[PDB]
Nucleic acid binder design. Structure first.
Lengths: 289, 289, 287, 289
DNA sequence: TTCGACCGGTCGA
DNA sequence: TTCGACCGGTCGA
DNA sequence: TCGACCGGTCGA
DNA sequence: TCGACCGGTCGA
């Protein structure tokens, strides 16, 4: 029956036949009866070998690492997205949302804000571009956003996802649409960058991400002159985090160490090593409370 | 013939036979007649095809795309270090040095500084760790460092490298050792991140680099209360830079936009698309002046 | 003697003599607005009083009873002199207002509802600390506003004689603008002093510092780098290099970073010898 | 015996016969045997009468309150400089000095610093002048300086002053000379502005004082990147301090409230109402610890 | 078709 | 070994 | 000439 | 009562 799987799709491109992995089909096809749990890494290899056996059975050629790197990325994100969906359900956080975000083009995360907040950000933008050396504040959407605003929770969000289905995955991955233009600037409490693995270079992308996000938030705090609002950014790896990874992720928010009296603040507040799905819950516990 | 090449080396690891690319040997072997010129890519391709032909001849396994990623980066950097070495020579700057840097563990770039400057850095970095929330300022060594300090130029540096040889390469790649602990903080004028290609995520590593580097420099300027001193960071790609790449690289140094009065500054001052070796000269012209 | 420049009030069965500098202005200028030497015109108002008592059977008002009065007079002169300036200058979108004390009318009141709010945000925030902090300074003697919709045709009628109303209309100009000034419509403030002392001069650096500090926060709330406020000083006497140096003290908040470009609390100090100089000063201030 | 006292003086101011209150001698005569104690407020009035009785007696006119205001202030600063000196004696702070400072011209307080610290200040004050809009950091010397540096205490400072005599007063008023060029920047812990009375305008001179002093200290902290060092400025009045006086003296250091996260600070940390010599000790107790 | 964001497989020290 | 820094091959929108 | 002090107001 | 003004010193 593997020859019937859809985790891989064939197509021609410029007369060239190519095979494409469909990460969601592999998910749906393996977890439609119960949602994954246990060791996250095993689930990633399980999903990967599955795709490899399906392709082997279809008589197609094993996808390149590039394909698997991409795919594994998605798998990791969705598993975390679903686990987060259920997390707030069983933890009964009726004023919190943990959203898996799309890329910045599909939906620039700045869109989640109410119009007053969107105006302040525009103020700053147009301003930074109004110079000899035009300046911007760009960063990829954070993988996960954690919002705390009661009036945004719809009763349907309280229905746990107990199996991976086109429908269930879609509701999780489109949850972001519901909050568009409705969040008060300080309703945003934290962001999380997800990475199946780290590298001396890639891990720095987390620091950049937390830095630009916290720089934006810092400007909203001044706009609304509110020193108590706080935004934290976190990183999560499915593998062990070395000391080197740790130190790197302790990098200060350059805008927070300008002054000798200024208090240091890390771009990435904390890095989590998620070995099991239970750990996702523990991480969220530490992030949210 | 090719079966005699050394661009590829075989070895066993845990009873498993593996083939390793030796990027330098491919360089030396393809350019001991004359140093590369023209289209940077056609050259990088030429260097890769050569690694594959030697592999088919040797009967060995065709190296993974991950092995050609690592390697290709090594080639780009090297092909540049050489062009820059002869650049300063053919343009005549007995006060400028363009150094290809090793990784931060082999030689933390902070070591290029004299004892007084390195102490100011210690003060800061020791201060940042002296908090409940420990903070650091970590970034990979910039690929290229441009120093301007007359007393550091040795007459040997004026001997152009006209062919790639174990020595021609080593002298270029060990040039950094000579200046250890001898640079005055403001002798450092610019850094350059080199990348054969960009990606929406990787390109942000340049912004992080420039940001942390400029943050450190900003603190030295404070330390020596010298508003004149500058440090600029640049990015160089061997491929076309899209409008998206551009905008992303216009990201400001968060620590320069804290105040409504603070003049915005870019983490990466400019991004260069280097199609030919002549462009490397043009880039350097704009950077140095 | 029939004059009202002076008075004689009861204070614990110890009859004392007060001066109503106002009358000593109208009663000495119902004719016309003084001009020429600010120095000499000041004494004219003083001898007019040194007499009202020398022929009314009274005693000499203390050096200080006059210091107070000598100040006022000085002020009203510049104050009234600025009215005939805007008019005889064509500054229809400008107002030069002689401010009352911060109690009578806290200058923060000149701002529209949105601006006054931002200020509340801040000054309320500053009080929300274990160590409560404030941003207090006496109202600047003179305020220069630039907002077209605040000019009323009556402001264009020059004052060519000092009368209870000419005074009263000037010393109340601030009322018309209350709660009507956009934040960036404030262009400058000026400190007036007949003389300067090494200690008293530091009050202008403070005045300007607290004013600029405030305005600075208005610039950040509206993220508008362009807007700017300036503070100036004015002595009816010479200014020594020590007064100049002291008055060069930049804003401690404008020199925090070795990159931030410095600014002075008091942008410039003017020595006004004649009424002709008041116009010159205003010319430089208004740009 | 009054008609020969030295508390006054008749100098020739272009013809006119003028009386120059000679303040120091008026203390030395009322206190030729013991230190003034009990009530400051009162002790001031008597000092005023004695000198106000050596006048009419000698057939002269009671010098103008102007000369008295000038005179009165000094008596206050002097009495304080004395109780302050004996104060560290009875308490025995063998590493503390409470110095009555001369005007900034006679001895610019910046002179108390060692070479290195004076250097840093020069950097700054030279930099500020290097602009289109020349800027300075000027303030009158603080009335009282409190230094904490063990190696500056000479055994001779431990001999309490029990009576006001020319030699005594002068040892107290020249104590500042001893420490010239010897203090480490952070050895300076607090300054105190003394005023027999306050006024809505004059009290703001205290705020300016503290502000400029704290601004300078702030730059030294930067210079030596030491966030631990702290300088406090206080005000002391011989009369009751109204709520208006209080609020005014609550004005913050414009340079500590530039950022929303910036933690606000007062130019004048606290204002003391000194009714008795008893209170001078109490004030110092607070200040010093 | 282009752009966004993902990461795994190195070679060298 | 592990740690530093490199980047090319995706799948989705 | 300059530094730093403050007490005696007039008005609200 | 509180706001803001400044002129008359004594010393260096």
């Amino acid at each position: 029956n593997l020859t019937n799987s859809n985790c891989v799709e064939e197509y021609k491109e410029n007369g060239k036949t190519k095979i494409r992995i469909k990460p969601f089909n592999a998910l749906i096809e393996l977890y439609h009866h119960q949602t994954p749990t246990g060791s996250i890494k095993e689930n990633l290899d399980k999903l990967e070998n599955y795709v490899k056996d399906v392709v082997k059975a279809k008589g197609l050629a094993i996808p390149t690492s590039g394909a698997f790197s991409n795919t594994r990325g998605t798998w990791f994100e969705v598993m975390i997205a679903i686990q987060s969906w259920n997390y707030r359900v069983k933890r009964e956080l009726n004023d919190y949302l943990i959203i898996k975000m799309p890329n910045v083009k599909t939906f620039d995360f700045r869109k989640i804000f109410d119009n007053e907040t969107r105006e302040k950000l525009h103020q700053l933008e147009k301003s930074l571009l109004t110079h000899k050396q035009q300046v911007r504040l760009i960063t990829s959407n954070p993988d996960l956003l954690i919002i705390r605003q009661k009036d945004l929770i719809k009763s349907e969000y309280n229905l746990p996802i107990n199996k991976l289905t086109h429908e269930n995955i879609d509701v999780a991955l489109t949850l972001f649409k519901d909050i568009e233009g409705k969040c008060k600037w300080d309703s945003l409490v934290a962001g999380v960058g997800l990475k199946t693995s780290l590298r001396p270079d890639r891990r720095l992308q987390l620091v950049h991400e937390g830095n630009i996000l916290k720089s934006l938030f810092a400007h909203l705090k001044m706009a609304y002159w509110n020193p108590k609002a706080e935004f934290k950014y976190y990183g999560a790896s499915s593998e062990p985090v070395s000391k080197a990874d740790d130190d790197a992720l302790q990098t200060a928010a350059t805008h927070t160490i300008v002054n000798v009296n200024s208090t240091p603040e890390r771009a990435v507040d904390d890095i989590f090593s998620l070995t099991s799905f239970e750990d996702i819950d523990k991480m969220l516990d530490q992030i949210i409370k």
